[PDB]
């Protein structure tokens, strides 16, 4: 169901075309939410008049930091589009990565769309990993925090937690690929770490557009804290998850009307 769309093929391609659009215009690149899949971008892409791609997080992506992750996604991009003027958007967690990407392209005139997300929106390894994976577990099962927390806290480290987690999950959905869950659970922790440890290097002088959800740091998601250029935020109908589904019509118009 909704759960298999929280998993990605660890060996799948990083950059995948999301719609037919044979056009010759510069494409629009969509950066995945924290779960790594470009599934949420399916509706939006199908209803877009420009070629749009998706970036998913597979085993090939370096997660030591948002900086590395962005530099790698930039490389995947330059294969489909070698030239400078880039159009990139990032959903939720992807927002931050998309920001770092355009940010690196700057230091090295691009369009940047943030779908309800932003760069904002050492001895405690154990608790961090436990809470991360504990959370991850709750997305696939019903298990109570405390019961799950009790099973993951005393474990040696990440791989034991991931394994114990994958077991708890399968004991609820036997059909889920254990290799995917295992990769999902582990990268999930690494993605959180990289994000909750990210802080823009310099100020972004480029034009940013925040498409915020209507139903819920102040209608800016702290964008102004890191941007100098034009920061325009549109309020879309729905909450964090429904926004791209019709808050989608609004978004489709806004994106269309922007990119000439």
From Swiss-Prot:
Q: How is it modified after translation?
A: In adipocytes, S-nitrosylation of Fatty acid synthase occurs under physiological conditions and gradually increases during adipogenesis.
Origin: domain of life:
Eukaryota
List Phosphoserine occurrences by residue: 20
Q: Which residues carry this modification: N6-acetyllysine?
A: 156
Indicate where this protein resides in the cell. Cytoplasm; Melanosome
Question: Which pairs are disulfide-linked?
Answer: none
Q: Where is this cross-link: Glycyl lysine isopeptide (Lys-Gly) (interchain with G-Cter in SUMO2)?
A: 214
Residue span of region Thioesterase: 2-260
The record places the active site at: 92 (for thioesterase activity), 240 (for thioesterase activity)
Q: In which tissues is it expressed?
A: Ubiquitous. Prominent expression in brain, lung, liver and mammary gland.
| Protein's job | Fatty acid synthetase is a multifunctional enzyme that catalyzes the de novo biosynthesis of long-chain saturated fatty acids starting from acetyl-CoA and malonyl-CoA in the presence of NADPH. This multifunctional protein contains 7 catalytic activities and a site for the binding of the prosthetic group 4'-phosphopantetheine of the acyl carrier protein ([ACP]) domain.
* Miscellaneous comment: The relatively low beta-ketoacyl synthase activity may be attributable to the low 4'-phosphopantetheine content of the protein.
Its subunit composition reads:
Homodimer which is arranged in a head to tail fashion. Interacts with CEACAM1; this interaction is insulin and phosphorylation-dependent; reduces fatty-acid synthase activity.
Q: What is this protein called?
A: Fatty acid synthase
Give the source species.
Homo sapiens
Task: Please name the taxonomic classification of the source.
Answer: Eukaryota, Metazoa, Chordata, Craniata, Vertebrata
